[PDB]
Ligand binder design. Structure first.
Ligand SMILES: *[C@@H]1O[C@H](CO)[C@@H](O[C@@H]2O[C@H](CO)[C@@H](O[C@@H]3O[C@H](CO[C@H]4O[C@H](CO)[C@@H](O)[C@H](O)[C@@H]4O)[C@@H](O)[C@H](O[C@H]4O[C@H](CO)[C@@H](O)[C@H](O)[C@@H]4O)[C@@H]3O)[C@H](O)[C@H]2NC(C)=O)[C@H](O)[C@H]1NC(C)=O
Ligand SMILES: *[C@@H]1O[C@H](CO)[C@@H](O[C@@H]2O[C@H](CO)[C@@H](O[C@@H]3O[C@H](CO[C@H]4O[C@H](CO)[C@@H](O)[C@H](O)[C@@H]4O)[C@@H](O)[C@H](O[C@H]4O[C@H](CO)[C@@H](O)[C@H](O)[C@@H]4O)[C@@H]3O)[C@H](O)[C@H]2NC(C)=O)[C@H](O)[C@H]1NC(C)=O
Ligand SMILES: *[C@@H]1O[C@H](CO)[C@@H](O[C@@H]2O[C@H](CO)[C@@H](O[C@@H]3O[C@H](CO[C@H]4O[C@H](CO)[C@@H](O)[C@H](O)[C@@H]4O)[C@@H](O)[C@H](O[C@H]4O[C@H](CO)[C@@H](O)[C@H](O)[C@@H]4O)[C@@H]3O)[C@H](O)[C@H]2NC(C)=O)[C@H](O)[C@H]1NC(C)=O
Ligand SMILES: *[C@@H]1O[C@H](CO)[C@@H](O[C@@H]2O[C@H](CO)[C@@H](O[C@@H]3O[C@H](CO[C@H]4O[C@H](CO)[C@@H](O)[C@H](O)[C@@H]4O)[C@@H](O)[C@H](O[C@H]4O[C@H](CO)[C@@H](O)[C@H](O)[C@@H]4O)[C@@H]3O)[C@H](O)[C@H]2NC(C)=O)[C@H](O)[C@H]1NC(C)=O
Ligand SMILES: *[C@@H]1O[C@H](CO)[C@@H](O[C@@H]2O[C@H](CO)[C@@H](O[C@@H]3O[C@H](CO)[C@@H](O)[C@H](O)[C@@H]3O)[C@H](O)[C@H]2NC(C)=O)[C@H](O)[C@H]1NC(C)=O
Ligand SMILES: *[C@@H]1O[C@H](CO)[C@@H](O[C@@H]2O[C@H](CO)[C@@H](O[C@@H]3O[C@H](CO)[C@@H](O)[C@H](O)[C@@H]3O)[C@H](O)[C@H]2NC(C)=O)[C@H](O)[C@H]1NC(C)=O
Ligand SMILES: CCOCc1nc2c(N)nc3ccccc3c2n1CC(C)(C)O
Ligand SMILES: CCOCc1nc2c(N)nc3ccccc3c2n1CC(C)(C)O
Ligand SMILES: *[C@@H]1O[C@H](CO)[C@@H](O)[C@H](O)[C@H]1NC(C)=O
Ligand SMILES: *[C@@H]1O[C@H](CO)[C@@H](O)[C@H](O)[C@H]1NC(C)=O
Ligand SMILES: *[C@@H]1O[C@H](CO)[C@@H](O)[C@H](O)[C@H]1NC(C)=O
Ligand SMILES: *[C@@H]1O[C@H](CO)[C@@H](O)[C@H](O)[C@H]1NC(C)=O
Ligand SMILES: *[C@@H]1O[C@H](CO)[C@@H](O)[C@H](O)[C@H]1NC(C)=O
Ligand SMILES: *[C@@H]1O[C@H](CO)[C@@H](O)[C@H](O)[C@H]1NC(C)=O
Ligand SMILES: *[C@@H]1O[C@H](CO)[C@@H](O)[C@H](O)[C@H]1NC(C)=O
Ligand SMILES: *[C@@H]1O[C@H](CO)[C@@H](O)[C@H](O)[C@H]1NC(C)=O
Lengths: 751, 751
């Protein structure tokens, strides 16, 4: 009753099977007949008939995507026997045609990233229960392909269809006779140079229209890009939008617009979000009649509208921006101006809800920072990637014109008002740098090439910063009072400040750490710390988490040196310590005993450790997680039960362990998750995993071990059959290296 | 007659065996009896008896360093049977004593890095042929160890001894009764507070004396450091040096000297190198009477004399520096001053021979650069690691107080006068930055945080730069005219300028490359180049070498994009191309065929390639070296000789190849060096390696293949004996992965 090759899961009272990435050459017939969802994606399967899915009654969803990995053949009516089938995902299979004989039970069908140039009534019209249909990315860029032929009224007969995506195919015309049920319609990069009055008429319900990339703006495009003749603007009929009163989302990005007709929006009182990126809008941003027509708009994206070859002193914002009442986020990137003056943003200052200004990639040399104060609600000021100084490669499921991730890390933003100045030129913070700013809880100074010695006065004008990102500078920590003006500081990120730490001759002072009452998280990673001046110890009463990865503890804890022996002992509250990537061959016993006893989580992974003294765990009563992955360890104690009562998770993967000690797990009742994968194990003995008392072990990962498949391994199989409460993942990757005839086979199949 | 386990090399008409790092548990009995030198270092050997070396007549040299790797037991008289044994290297063996009954034939004995606390007549005084004796690093730092007992008169009887190294042991006094034949005496870090008149009295042959680290300067020490009481200076009697008239080299580093007694040098006409580092000499550097005593001095190291807690405006250089008329290099690092004024260096400007001035690590904010022109001979101006703005962990065989590597890369300095500005704050190069400089052939701007768009005017004042290091900046290459003012430019390093390259939205211009008539070497590595503006090709008629590693050719050569297909074709002179670390899964055939036909050397290593089209090698008539290492490749052609006339070296290591096709070594007469190491080969059939016609192959690397050890290998073993002209290195590392009873065995030992 151990599921193979697939893994069985429990989700919303329905059990699902994950067969993905298992190197399968066909549809496994061992799939449990009770499964409602089946993921076959990323395998070698070359064929599908009506015999593949047999016996599966309740199956509602099948993922066949990315098959074969590195010419999928589907028969006519291969899916026909499946009555309960809802969602079918065929993406990236090199299908020359829409498969015929698809069931009429389909509510969702994704053919994305295939060779299909023909949308036919024969394959489509019969399925009337379709909600979502994904045809995108069949013909695009420099791919060898044909123009998409859409047979007349192929879509007319799906009267339930709420979503249609034809994006990234050669179309040249909006398809006629679209069902009035359409909610979202994606026409992006379809080569449609003209939008008529007739095109969208029947759609009274449209929530979203994507016309983007038709007559694109092609200068400096990171994809093969073909403009309309002379680089003309897309032609939109004055009345093209008259009948869309429900539109929430309009994507006009990269349509080469020099002009917005305000009457496009006349009939769109509720428009939420308008994507205007990659057009020529500098003229419209300055005048902009259409901005009077957008009272409910929450998100405006004007990014990359810059005039080629122009570096203007200031950005010209129309007073009519003040008419955008509901505006939440304003995105202006790639406008390209020299200087931000307080009076240039005047139209934005009265807007009640505007929480976000995105000025990224403007090459801005200077900003009058007092201007953000005069706004009302700003929670996010994103200045990243400017010149501010002191004083298939494309994911088909992603937005094509910008990244969709948060501008600021959620963990920083959740503290309060956020100012992101990262990837700029502020190499020295003077006395007046932060004056007349709002009360900033979240500050990103990352990547400023800052070489200064922070003296304790630099942040006085913004004392309430909780989260400070100083990463990727060259900071010189020469002052014990550094940063201590921020008394409320919770998270401090010092990563990638290695510049001065690497020099033995200059002085290094980390003592300021102890001066914070509320400091919770400190990241010291990749600083190359091997030496400190006069004070060898880190000390904090508050600190919870310390990331020390990417430093040299191999030097600090060198056998001939007593000085750093207590380096972490003074962090009295510490529950999480990351020692990874320290080049550690061995940790001196006394050094390990000096780690804080409060630790619940300890990462020693990705070092060179040949040696671990397990006895020392006796001094860490709270330790739930020990991560030893990526070391050289050849040996396991047999005594672990007397070393720890607390250890829940033990990660040993990618080590040299050749053997599992008799009664390895005897009496260790704490241990839930043991990862033995990617080791030297030849086999596992009877007495190895046997215990008389209770055990909560729920997961054991053996994959990547060179098991000897002779009868010696029989007992382990018998252990596996006896305990099914212990989950063993990727059974297909648990593989017999010997005997010669068993090579490549899974250890779960044997005489 | 294939040598095992050692590899036997021919050196200066003699024969040496390299046995190092072979995991040998004891001394091999198979060593050729004609070998003059034997390196057993870094093995597991735990025992040396008089039966270990039997049969070896002419052995002059034995290296036992680092055994066992992670207590070497040497029996009394073990080495006695070796009459011709001269050099014995016993380093890092944890020897508790000097091994008794060593041969009287020893000229050189190295006991460095052991546990020996007693130097006795029994172990030493009988070796009267000793020239070099190394006892260093036995007791030092926080190591648990004993003060060194040196038995009275122990060295007295060694009348040929020219080199004695006692450094890093606790001595407390110079040993009495040293032989007058001494040339070089190393007493560093021996805890000697006082040097009397008697200590060196009779050594009239001494050319080198090292007293460094005695009464050390401990502030900011990156090792456990114990100062003399009160941090006081070493006490050197006025007459301590009076008889050493031959002294060339004196190391006084870190002796805590406040004052230098000029009479120390009264009798030292030959003194060439003086090391004064890590003392408190700022006063002496200003006054400097002792300088008059050193007109023959070539090298003076004053580095790290800074006064604690002091950041003076100017360096104060005594007029008496003008007296050093033989000075070649002056090292003043870590003096710590703000500004370098032309007058400050006056005393140096008439020194005829001074070619090197080292100003590293002073935190200098500004220099008046015109001063360097008043000098006479300056070839090396080292300004690295300053504040300049726009206008066991210790190697026992290395210098303890500074790196000995060249200040400037020799490839760069060879061109002429060098200015090294690396690791400063020059973030913008203005019109006057480089005015009044000498004719600078070699310029290092690395790690200056420079974000500018170089327009072609920045270097005009130093138009003759041959070698330009721009690495580790954030350069915005926005101008086709960049650098073109340097018309004689030969080597250009742009590595780690990825900042703006990684942003798709900004413009990227590499066209400037073509404007150089003499450009030879170009490093573009780790720039993350995935997109360029309007001009997709790199073109030069001059270029010989191009390093493209760490870029994205996976993106540039993506299937759906034809734009970069010719990217390297326009480099018509190119013989060397590095395509490593481009994340390549495969290379489009036409993209490959557009690689310059002139290539003699091509590196595709460390990509993701599963496919290589060998046929395409036809278009590369000059290709000697193909580097495929670190890929996923499963497949070799059996037709290879059809595709290449020229291929000398083929590196296949770390790939997926499990099989060698029949009749390969047939007809390929060009291939001397083939590396198949770290592949999946189970065996090699007869059929693989046969050829009728000649085969020039001189090396074949098999290590790391899971070899099958049945009689099916006997075919290959047969081949190996029948060709001794093909050397297979690391034979101990060519190891059978089956049968289970044959595991770990080298393939070279079997029935
Ligand atoms: C022009 O502008 C318009 C409007 O801004 C863009 O429309 C958006 O397009 C993107 C990308 O195609 C859509 O993003 C995707 O949304 C999918 C829909 O998810 C819905 O349902 C799920 C679950 O039922 C909900 O969680 C979710 O809230 C939605 O209600 C998601 O399924 C996608 O997620 C998957 O892919 C991403 C990326 O790989 C992964 O991160 C996820 O884990 C997951 O695997 C994705 O988020 C977006 O929905 C569209 N907006 C609207 C309103 O529908 C156009 O793309 C744009 N044109 C171009 C060419 O840029
Ligand atoms: C310097 O070091 C600091 C401190 O570690 C780093 O900052 C932390 O980075 C880690 C990731 O490395 C963050 O941990 C992750 O947080 C994500 C945020 O989740 C929030 O919201 C979700 C719901 O969406 C909640 O579940 C969650 O409680 C949070 O409220 C999580 O999504 C992540 O969980 C996933 O990944 C981890 C493994 O990475 C799994 O264990 C989880 O099961 C799950 O799969 C993860 O927990 C952490 O939040 C950061 N902390 C802070 C203070 O910001 C810096 O990144 C580092 N700096 C540099 C340069 O590296
Ligand atoms: C105080 O100052 C004095 C004077 O500067 C220093 O004396 C020097 O000390 C260093 C390190 O001990 C010596 O450097 C080593 O010299 C060895 C001897 O080489 C001689 O013979 C070989 C051929 O047999 C020639 O190649 C060479 O030119 C010499 O004639 C070298 O063998 C060493 O190189 C080996 O080790 C290094 C480091 O591991 C490797 O990089 C090399 O590849 C090689 O494996 C090494 O170069 C130096 O010779 C001394 N100078 C003199 C004139 O004797 C003191 O070190 C200093 N005190 C302290 C504590 O720093
Ligand atoms: C950007 O890219 C450039 C161009 O590749 C890099 O600069 C080159 O880097 C390599 C080092 O990787 C240099 O090649 C090496 O040259 C050494 C110089 O030796 C000189 O002098 C000796 C005599 O003392 C002569 O034998 C020789 O002809 C030279 O004149 C050699 O010692 C090296 O040989 C050793 O290593 C190589 C493998 O690396 C082996 O093939 C050899 O057998 C031997 O073991 C090596 O050949 C090259 O000279 C540099 N060129 C220039 C123009 O400087 C940059 O480093 C790179 N930038 C960055 C930041 O990475
Ligand atoms: C301060 O600003 C810097 C620079 O803008 C921010 O660094 C950026 O952080 C983002 C989000 O974490 C990174 O994006 C992510 O990269 C990872 C790893 O490849 C990927 O898994 C995610 O999906 C996402 O793409 C981005 O790489 C990084 N940029 C650089 C150049 O460092 C930083 O996050 C900011 N700090 C705060 C507190 O927000
Ligand atoms: C310009 O200045 C920079 C910075 O000072 C120089 O970079 C430095 O180059 C040296 C010499 O190659 C590097 O040291 C070497 O490191 C290797 C690898 O670890 C080691 O095997 C060698 O023994 C040697 O010590 C050093 O890492 C590097 N420093 C930094 C911070 O990047 C550069 O060489 C200069 N360019 C020229 C033309 O001189
Ligand atoms: C040779 C190095 O001597 C120690 C040192 N370390 C630093 C440092 N990390 N930063 C500095 C910044 C400005 C001025 C001096 C220093 C400095 N200094 C110089 C001094 C102020 C005398 O300590
Ligand atoms: C969103 C930016 O689009 C193109 C661009 N690329 C760069 C660049 N690599 N560098 C710049 C430096 C100074 C001023 C402008 C630019 C610039 N610019 C701006 C502009 C001058 C309009 O091209
Ligand atoms: C401002 O936002 C709130 C919700 O956050 C909403 O109730 C209100 O309608 C918004 N005001 C405007 C002018 O849209
Ligand atoms: C830190 O810097 C401030 C300002 O330079 C200074 O007043 C204070 O003395 C410094 N503290 C130290 C050196 O620990
Ligand atoms: C210890 O850590 C916890 C968790 O963050 C925190 O609530 C508590 O205040 C800390 N103790 C001290 C002394 O700051
Ligand atoms: C492990 O540490 C203990 C101290 O609890 C010590 O007695 C023992 O020697 C250590 N074991 C090894 C193998 O070093
Ligand atoms: C030193 O310089 C003078 C000329 O300034 C030159 O004649 C002499 O040859 C040089 N000496 C050495 C040893 O290079
Ligand atoms: C490069 O810069 C120079 C100097 O500013 C300018 O004259 C020239 O037009 C620029 N060339 C370009 C933009 O390619
Ligand atoms: C081609 O390379 C060789 C070797 O560097 C060089 O001599 C020659 O000048 C180069 N050709 C041109 C056109 O510069
Ligand atoms: C190898 O390249 C040649 C072009 O000369 C092409 O005909 C052949 O199909 C290629 N082989 C493969 C497997 O792509």
């Amino acid at each position: 009753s151990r599921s193979y090759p697939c893994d069985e899961k429990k989700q919303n009272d329905s059990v699902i099977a994950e067969c993905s990435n298992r190197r399968l050459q066909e549809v496994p017939q061992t799939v449990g007949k009770y499964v409602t969802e089946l993921d076959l994606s990323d395998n070698f399967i070359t064929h599908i008939t009506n015999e593949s899915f047999q016996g599966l009654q309740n199956l509602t969803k099948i993922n066949l995507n990315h098959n074969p990995n590195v010419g999928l053949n589907i028969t006519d009516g291969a899916f026909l026997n499946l009555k309960n089938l809802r969602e079918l995902l065929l993406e990236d299979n090199q299908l020359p045609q829409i498969p015929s004989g698809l069931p009429e039970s389909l509510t969702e069908l994704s053919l994305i990233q295939n060779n299909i140039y023909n949308i036919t009534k024969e394959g489509i019209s019969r399925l009337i229960n379709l909600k979502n249909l994904y045809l995108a990315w069949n013909c695009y860029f420099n791919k060898v392909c044909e123009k998409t032929n859409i047979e007349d009224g192929v879509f007319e007969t799906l009267t339930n269809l709420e979503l249609l995506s034809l994006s990234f195919n050669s179309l040249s015309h909006v398809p006629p006779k679209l069902p009035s049920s359409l909610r979202k319609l994606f026409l992006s990069n379809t080569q449609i140079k003209y939008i008529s009055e007739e095109d969208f008429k029947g759609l009274i319900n449209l929530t979203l229209l994507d016309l983007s990339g038709n007559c694109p703006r092609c200068f400096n495009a990171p994809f093969p890009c073909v403009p309309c003749d002379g680089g003309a603007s897309i032609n939109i009929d004055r009345f093209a939008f008259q009948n869309l009163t429900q539109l929430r989302y309009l994507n006009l990005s990269s349509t080469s617009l020099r002009k917005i007709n305000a009457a496009w929006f006349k009939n769109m009182p509720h428009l939420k979000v308008l994507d205007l990126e990659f057009n020529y809008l500098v003229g419209e941003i300055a005048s902009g009649a259409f901005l009077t027509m957008l009272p409910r708009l929450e998100i405006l994206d004007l990014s990359f509208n810059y005039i080629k070859g122009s570096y203007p002193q200031h950005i010209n914002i129309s007073r009519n921006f003040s008419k955008l009442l509901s505006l939440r986020a304003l995105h202006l990137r790639g406008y390209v101006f020299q200087e931000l003056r307080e009076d240039d943003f005047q139209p934005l200052m009265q807007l009640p809800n505007l929480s976000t200004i995105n000025l990224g990639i403007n090459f801005i040399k200077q900003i009058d920072f007092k201007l953000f104060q005069n706004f009302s609600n700003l929670e996010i000021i994103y200045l990243s990637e400017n010149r501010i100084s002191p004083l298939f490669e494309f994911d088909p499921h992603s937005n094509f014109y910008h990244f969709t991730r948060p501008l600021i890390k959620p963990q920083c933003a959740a503290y309060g008002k956020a100012l992101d100045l990262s990837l700029n030129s502020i190499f020295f913070i003077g006395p007046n740098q932060f004056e007349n700013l709002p009360d900033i809880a979240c500050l990103n100074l990352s990547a400023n090439s800052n070489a200064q010695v922070l003296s304790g006065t630099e942040f006085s004008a913004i004392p309430h910063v909780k989260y400070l990102d100083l990463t990727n500078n060259r900071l010189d920590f020469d002052n014990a009072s550094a940063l201590t003006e921020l008394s409320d500081l919770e998270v401090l990120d010092l990563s990638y400040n290695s510049h001065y730490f690497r020099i033995a001759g200059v002085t290094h002072h980390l003592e300021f750490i102890q001066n914070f009452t509320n400091l919770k998280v400190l990241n010291l990673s990749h600083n190359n710390i091997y030496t400190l001046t006069d004070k060898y110890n880190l000390e904090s009463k508050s600190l919870v988490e310390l990331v020390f990865s990417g430093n040299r503890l191999d030097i600090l804890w060198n056998d001939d040196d007593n000085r750093y022996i207590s380096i972490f002992k003074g962090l009295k509250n510490l529950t999480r310590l990351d020692l990874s990537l320290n080049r550690l061959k061995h940790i001196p016993n006394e050094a390990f005993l000096n780690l804080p006893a409060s630790l619940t989580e300890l990462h020693i992974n990705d070092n060179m450790l040949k040696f671990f003294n397990w006895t020392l765990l006796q001094q860490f009563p709270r330790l739930e997680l020990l991560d030893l992955r990526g070391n050289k360890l050849l040996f396991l104690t047999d005594s672990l039960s007397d070393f720890t009562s607390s250890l829940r998770t033990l990660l040993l993967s990618h080590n040299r362990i050749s053997h599992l000690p008799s009664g390895f797990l005897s009496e260790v009742s704490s241990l839930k998750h043991l990862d033995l994968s990617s080791n030297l194990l030849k086999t596992i003995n009877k007495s190895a995993l046997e215990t008389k008392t209770t055990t909560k072990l729920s997961m054991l990962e053996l994959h990547g071990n060179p098991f000897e498949c002779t009868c010696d391994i029989g007992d382990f199989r018998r252990w596996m059959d006896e305990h099914l409460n212990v989950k063993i993942p990727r059974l297909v990757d648990v593989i017999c290296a010997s005997p010669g005839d068993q090579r490549g086979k899974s250890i779960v199949s044997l005489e």
